[PDB]
Amino acid sequence: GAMAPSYRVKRMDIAKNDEECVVNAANPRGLPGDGVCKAVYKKWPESFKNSATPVGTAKTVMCGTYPVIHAVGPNFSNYTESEGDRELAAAYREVAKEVTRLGVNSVAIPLLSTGVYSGGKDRLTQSLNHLFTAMDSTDADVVIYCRDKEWEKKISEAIQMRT
Numbered sequence: 001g002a003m004a005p006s007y008r009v010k011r012m013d014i015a016k017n018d019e020e021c022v023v024n025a026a027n028p029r030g031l032p033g034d035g036v037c038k039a040v041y042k043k044w045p046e047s048f049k050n051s052a053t054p055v056g057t058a059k060t061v062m063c064g065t066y067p068v069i070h071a072v073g074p075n076f077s078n079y080t081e082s083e084g085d086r087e088l089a090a091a092y093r094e095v096a097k098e099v100t101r102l103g104v105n106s107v108a109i110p111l112l113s114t115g116v117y118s119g120g121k122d123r124l125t126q127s128l129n130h131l132f133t134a135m136d137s138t139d140a141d142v143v144i145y146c147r148d149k150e151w152e153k154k155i156s157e158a159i160q161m162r163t
């Protein structure tokens with residue numbers, strides 16, 4: 001793992017990450033989708049061979065030797081707040097298992113269920129806290145990707161708060 005495991009946040013295209021593997025905010029059917037999922041499809045299209053997986057799970061497919069971890073957050077349009085929250089926590093726990101199995105020293109990760117799966121709500125804090133619960137016990141350097149200038153500030157603050 002990383003010598004001093006850390007969290008960082010960058011405001012850029014996750015398709016341009018400088019990490020040893022990437023987490024896709026995937027749909028359950030392995031379709032190209034939109035947002036992060038569309039950029040991942042354009043950069044690593046080979047990774048979508050048999051990528052379909054249920055909500056609350058993660059499935060890794062290699063693009064050459066570069067791992068793409070397809071993590072399926074819930075669509076809060078379809079789920080109750082209670083069941084959506086349980087599936088969102090589960091998806092990040094499956095990501096932590098896959099990152100550990102792969103033996104990577106770093107991972108690029110988006111906030112799951114915060115874009116077109118958010119059901120039109122701000123889920124920054126909900127999704128980030130589930131990311132921390134899952135990844136805190138791993139020793140990989142985690143680099144969180146966002147697009148919004150205000151989200152970059154709010155994620156940076158939440159990382160710095162814990163030290």
Ligand SMILES: Nc1nc2ccc(F)cc2s1
Binds near residue numbers: 035039110148
């Ligand atoms: N290509 C893209 N990368 C990201 C990374 C984070 C994000 F929130 C949106 C996008 S769209």
Ligand SMILES: [Cl-]
Binds near residue numbers: 011012013016
């Ligand atoms: Cl960029």
Ligand SMILES: [Cl-]
Binds near residue numbers: 112113115116
């Ligand atoms: Cl999303």
